[PDB]
Design a binder for this molecule. Structure first.
Ligand SMILES: Nc1ncnc2c1ncn2[C@@H]1O[C@H](COP(=O)(O)OP(=O)(O)O)[C@@H](O)[C@H]1O
Ligand SMILES: Nc1ncnc2c1ncn2[C@@H]1O[C@H](COP(=O)(O)OP(=O)(O)O)[C@@H](O)[C@H]1O
Lengths: 684, 684
């Protein structure tokens, strides 16, 4: 009964460490007496490996299920394969102009060409997009309201020591997976990679319920969740080392460095499970695992920086627009119509997604097609090529028009969608926009060299009769730069990109563009998109990048103030159960120091509301607190700090040890108490 | 003047953080006034990259110089290349039974064969080994007494916040490098890999002196040293990721995770400098960089565990013998004759090193020859081979005799040498002993399979007419297991091994053997050899693996005790210059709290002996301390803790924040002070 934390609060880690210490002492007491005790102790010890192992296995299985369901469903938007209903379009196309894969215009109208078939397929596409969007939103609203958003803000807040009982419950796993599948099915500008971490996290949570050790102790569950975060990111990107570094960089809040092997094993197990699972015959770990064998030139360095500016500048734009819109939509009438709003957004997407050739295709496949340079058998309009430079046809102008319109779409439509009550991620929109910009700049530079190759800056670099530029690397660097400039990741992103796409020959432009994008972005708000999303949520995140301009002390922050009523404390002997009931009913606080008497106001001990309550009605069902006596249940060694302390040290202590609140006393006379929420309130 | 730390003490990190904050405020006050201050600020910001870059570059250059010099010296121990004096035997032999590479017997006697030449070469080998040993010990004794030991324990203590002014001085770099070269030249059971980190560290230190930001600041220099540790380990082993993972695990004490990129870049820079530098034409990054393309069988798993036991047991044995001997040699007359002791040890080495074929050769080359399996052109006695199993000749028995004698010599002599007043390391002896044991077990299993292949346990796995076992992998796993079992490294060691020896097909047995050896070793002392030396030196290391059995409080450790005189404190108004001077001269303490008056004994402020003294003579050259007045110089916000605090929380705060000492007060009445040394003393 003691030690339970109310939902929507912050954990106190040192008490949890003391609980673990007493549990360890109890285990050691009976450890060596019998072989059965030894077996139990070894099982408890191996539980540390077991939680990570089961979490990784479940994360891999869930990722496989989600991937197969998602690609299957998003394939249904186009047509069906009569011969094999269970397969998708590409399985039937390769399972041998694919007659066995029919569309709906031919299915009903019987015509595969002409305005009529085009209109029929268009109207169907809108209809099916609406159906998936509506059903996903209805399911999430009815069955799980915490599937919203991406899942990085909430997880970051959870690991720091926050509590959200339902955000990782047994129920949210099923609903989250189903609605993520059905949301990525609709083709909305939202991914199934990043948010999958949440799913991974859930695994840990659920399995942590089976072992008592990691359930009662909050810090142990937090460590398991920090491991599951790396496992989930590794599954999402197939970057186990990137996944481990991700938890340290932008997810985990506390790291004793003794669980790094746990995170590494989690990322290995989850990746292994994901790659092993391929029932339909798929070979790639992820849909868009690509490899390169193309070179790049030193003179080619100048344009990345230019692109880097975009990869950064867009960041500043995005984090300045969506955050604004995400605010406005939460205050105007529009926030009271979730289902209708998401229907409208998805309808706008589909209506302005099918006509454009690129957007009609799932965003992962668009990213792939932008990654790969024109293949020997490639004959798409993206490579409208018919002299030192290769000739270009008139169709390149049309391709540029179509692709620039696709960019102008993907940049706008993504801003409005991340604040919807359905699963969504930002990795995919960022990657896609960056890759699109990269391809644009690559084509532009190729044409510019073609027209004016006679200049000295070009004749000595570009070879005659051969390609001089590699737009695939431009797409890669653009994607990485935009992702870095939106979510302000520099090293974890580079590691994940390296693991996703093998080949060390491209690390230099990637690092250059990422650093340039970060530099540009920091000038327009040094907080990542996830940081500012937590800010909008108002969650209690204790930033490790703030600076105190004023040389102020806790004297200005210790509560109460001259304009606030006095704090509530407790006495030992003169006070009985009835007074305790009256005080508890007549006050709405959480923690109470205990003092000898009112006149002295000298700090003696500390206690919390819920222990005091449960204890008093337990005693009533079945008074002096100093040396019936209730001294034992009263904690007597609370952490203190000198009242004249500078605030910076107090903040550092809270961040390092993880104490929800600390007292503040003068000459031994208790004065005030400071909690994380108060520190954040003064942080404004 | 204020803030300087006396040698052989521990740093207080929070005051250093406050100094960093005030410096940051001072720099910010004038950041935007003109472009010149902007340039200065950017230079200060880039200083963080600059220190690591210069440290890595210098470490690489020094490692290259040391490697070439060590090869050249240890090569002259055998003979000389008359045609080209500067070259070594290997280059001269490859520069075309090598007539241009002459030996001593031919040079003087003129005959390359017969007992006479054997005796001449043997005696000259002993003489030259004595010459190198004597010169090395004389140089280290005369010019640098801190080059002793390996250098890992001292570095571990330095990063934690210890101070040793001379252990990294401008002078110790030259002497340390020279004597390490001349010591590895003698061929003693000691390597130039591990200790090179010390050299790397020095670089950092020295170059840190050029930037005021990183010089006056202790914690910043500690971060630079933690980076240089990874850089040095990377240079020694050619494992940049290995070095970065090593710094966190067994070297660094504090890591804010914001310098991990610094350590990673230091490792890359150092590795690049090392590989680039090869003036004599060498291509390998290290002497013994190897690659493998050999398979292994699952049924082959059983003996690794057996070998693991050895790799474990030897660990326990070694850490139980040397630590004992290193104690005895420091308390008996033998400790007053350093030069003669090292002469005796080197003489024993050389005299009992040449007759055995393996020990005659430098230990790195022995490790290489044990790593590589018999090549197609190999015809050495190690491969005495002339039916399902390959026939074995009589020479295998003689090879086994010689190699077991070599193992006995290496296990025996290595114990006595690590406590000598010359540069030495444990990586090389551990690797060599483990590899030797691995090769022994490999040959034994091959012979067993040859003799008793008829059993069902072999016919199902070992093919006819081809080799069934790979002793090279056995040597690799033995080396890794012994190193893990002596130095108690599990993950950093395995990553370093992977980087040193490419190929992921050999991670499973490495992990198995390392884990088994660690399990076996922990049963015989859970402290690594490096930890055991840090203990024996008595340095103030605050272990993060101890457990308090008694439910004791700081009330048990607050000083003074009933049996000790009272603490020295200071008044503010009634005191003057004469009284404070007399009190300072009459006491030998380090910290002094300041109180209103003797009767009250209420904590008010705190100060230090050295700061107080410097302030006193400064004031006298050119009294009230409360609100001439010396209030300002008196610190007024010292960290405190409640007297009834459990000791565990106090230890945790010291380990986390890094405070030398904390006061302890009751009811606001100051009672005592607890410092790291006192906590360690009660840790006994
Ligand atoms: N009017 C007040 N008078 C005295 N103390 C106050 C007053 N208001 C708030 N406090 C102190 O601030 C704390 C509330 O901070 P907060 O973190 O928001 O909630 P909690 O303390 O439940 O975590 C209380 O525990 C209390 O000690
Ligand atoms: N006899 C004593 N009476 C009161 N205090 C003592 C006594 N001996 C030691 N102390 C306390 O212990 C501290 C010495 O601890 P130690 O860490 O070994 O040295 P330092 O304080 O110089 O680091 C002193 O600063 C002092 O406050």
């Amino acid at each position: 009964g003691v030690g339970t934390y109310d939902d929507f609060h912050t954990i106190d880690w040192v008490r949890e460490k003391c609980k673990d210490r007493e549990r360890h002492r109890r285990i050691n007491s009976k450890k060596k007496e019998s072989a059965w005790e030894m077996t139990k102790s070894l099982y408890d010890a191996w539980s540390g490996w077991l939680v990570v192992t089961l979490t990784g296995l479940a994360s891999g299985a869930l990722a496989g299920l989600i991937d197969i369901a998602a690609d299957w469903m998003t394939d249904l938007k186009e047509g069906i394969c009569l011969s094999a209903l269970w397969y998708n379009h590409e399985q039937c196309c390769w399972g041998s102009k694919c007659p066995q894969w029919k569309t709906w215009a031919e299915l009903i109208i019987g015509q595969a060409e002409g305005p009529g078939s085009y209109i029929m397929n268009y109207i169907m596409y809108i209809f099916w997009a609406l159906s998936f969007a509506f059903l996903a939103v209805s399911l999430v609203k009815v069955f799980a309201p915490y599937a919203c958003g991406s899942g990085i803000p909430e997880i970051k807040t959870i690991l720091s020591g926050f509590i959200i009982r339902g955000y990782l419950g047994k129920w949210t796993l099923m609903i989250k997976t189903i609605t993520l599948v059905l949301a990525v099915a609709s083709g909305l500008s939202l991914g199934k990679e990043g948010p999958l971490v949440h799913v991974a996290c859930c695994c840990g949570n659920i399995f942590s319920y089976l072992f008592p050790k990691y359930s009662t102790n909050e810090a142990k569950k937090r460590e398991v969740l920090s491991a599951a975060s790396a496992a989930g990111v590794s599954v999402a990107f197939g970057a186990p080392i990137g996944g481990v570094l991700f938890s340290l960089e932008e997810v985990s809040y506390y790291f004793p460095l003794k669980t790094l092997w746990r995170s590494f094993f989690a990322a290995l197990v989850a990746a292994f499970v994901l790659r092993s699972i391929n029932p339909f015959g798929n070979s790639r770990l992820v849909l868009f695992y690509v490899e390169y064998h193309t070179p790049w030139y030193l003179f080619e360095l100048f344009p990345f920086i230019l692109l880097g500016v975009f990869g950064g500048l867009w960041g500043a734009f995005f984090i300045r627009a969506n955050i604004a819109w995400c605010r406005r939509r939460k205050s105007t009438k529009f926030g009271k119509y979730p289902v209708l709003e998401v229907i409208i957004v998805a309808a706008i997407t589909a209506v302005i997604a099918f006509p454009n050739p690129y957007t009609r295709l799932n965003t992962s496949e668009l990213i792939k097609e932008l990654f790969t340079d024109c293949g020997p058998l490639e004959s798409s309009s993206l490579c409208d090529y018919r002299i030192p430079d290769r000739p270009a046809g008139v169709g390149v102008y049309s391709a540029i028009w179509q692709l620039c319109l696709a960019l102008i779409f993907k940049i706008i439509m993504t801003v409005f969608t991340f604040g919807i009550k359905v699963p969504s991620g930002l990795f995919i929109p960022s990657m896609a926009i960056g890759a699109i910009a990269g391809r644009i700049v690559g084509i532009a530079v190729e044409q510019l060299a073609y027209y004016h190759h006679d200049w000295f800056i070009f004749k000595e670099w570009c070879e005659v009769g051969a390609d001089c530029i590699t737009p695939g690397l431009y797409a890669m660097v653009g994607a990485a730069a935009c992702l870095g400039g939106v979510t302000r990741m520099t090293v974890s992103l580079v590691v994940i990109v390296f693991e996703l796409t093998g080949g060390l020959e491209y690390i230099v432009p990637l690092m250059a563009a990422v650093m340039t994008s970060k530099w540009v972005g920091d000038a327009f708000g040094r907080e990542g998109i996830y940081e500012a999303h937590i800010r909008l949520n108002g969650y209690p995140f204790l930033d490790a990048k703030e600076e105190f301009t004023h040389t102020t002390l806790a004297a200005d922050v210790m509560r109460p103030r001259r304009s606030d009523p006095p704090l509530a404390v407790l006495t030992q002997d003169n006070m009985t159960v009835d007074d305790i009931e009256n005080m508890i009913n007549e006050t709405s606080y959480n923690g109470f120091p205990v003092i000898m008497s009112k006149e002295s106001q000298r700090l003696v001990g500390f206690a919390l509301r819920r222990d005091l309550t449960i204890a008093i009605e337990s005693a009533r069902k079945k008074v002096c607190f100093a040396q019936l006596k209730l001294r034992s249940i009263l904690d007597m060694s609370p952490f203190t700090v000198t009242d004249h302390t500078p605030m910076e040290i107090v903040v550092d202590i809270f961040r390092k040890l993880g104490l929800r609140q600390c007292l503040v006393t003068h000459n031994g006379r208790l004065l005030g108490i400071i909690t994380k929420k108060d520190i954040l309130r003064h942080m404004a």
